[PDB]
């Protein structure tokens, strides 16, 4: 459905439109069009997160 | 870019963005034909594409 991406570092959300996560979580990448900030889904919510904090899972 | 709500939409899940008719949502992704990703009140969520505009 969506690509998934592995969190490489912890990311602390500081606004409601951010998607915080812990290194190791696997984020559903709804929108990877922006080069700086992707839109993810994790813990049933949507949010922006730094595209360079994750790696695509290829399998 | 921005879009005007045509209809009220009640969010029933945490990944949905609810809104009232006439509110003007920011559209972060219009690439999906059915369900767009918006921001309102500084929260993101999915909502039915056909329930809104666009202006930007």
């Amino acid at each position: 459905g969506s690509p998934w991406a592995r969190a490489l570092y912890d990311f602390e959300a500081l606004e409601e439109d951010e998607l915080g996560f812990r290194s190791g979580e696997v984020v559903e990448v709804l929108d990877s069009s922006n080069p700086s900030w992707w839109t993810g889904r994790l813990h049933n919510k949507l949010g922006l997160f730094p595209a360079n904090y994750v790696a695509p899972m290829m399998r | 870019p921005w879009a005007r709500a045509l209809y009220d939409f009640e969010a029933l899940e945490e990944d949905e963005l609810g809104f009232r008719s006439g509110e003007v949502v920011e559209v972060l992704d219009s690439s999906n034909p059915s369900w767009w990703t918006g921001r309102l009140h500084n929260k993101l969520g999915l909502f039915p594409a056909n329930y809104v505009a666009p202006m930007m």
């Binding site: 709804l30 | 059915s34 369900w35 999915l46």
Partner: peptide
Amino acid sequence: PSIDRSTKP
């Protein structure tokens, strides 16, 4: 019309 959640990403 009809809101179909089956097409949500």
